[PDB]
Amino acid sequence: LEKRDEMREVARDWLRVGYVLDRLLFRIYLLAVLAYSITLVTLWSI
Amino acid sequence: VRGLLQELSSIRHF
Fold first, then answer.
1. How many other C-beta atoms are found inside a 10 Å radius of the C-beta of residue A7?
2. For chain A, which terminus, N or C, has the lower number of CB atoms within 10 Å?
3. How far is CA B7 from CA A3, A4, A44, B2, B4, in A?
4. How far A8 CA lies from chain B's nearest CA (Å)?
């Protein structure tokens, strides 16, 4: 029982890490897209 | 007194 439970807890922690990294990289990607877009429109205006 | 309960408690916990 604890043999399975241990691996379940480890998988839970790796899930935590993966989730944090995923959210952070989501922020980064979103900001990157917005910046690329604002450069696009600043080029469009000029 | 027997320590069988400390095992069952853990199993139930899981």
1. 10
2. C
3. 14, 16, 71, 11, 6
4. 11
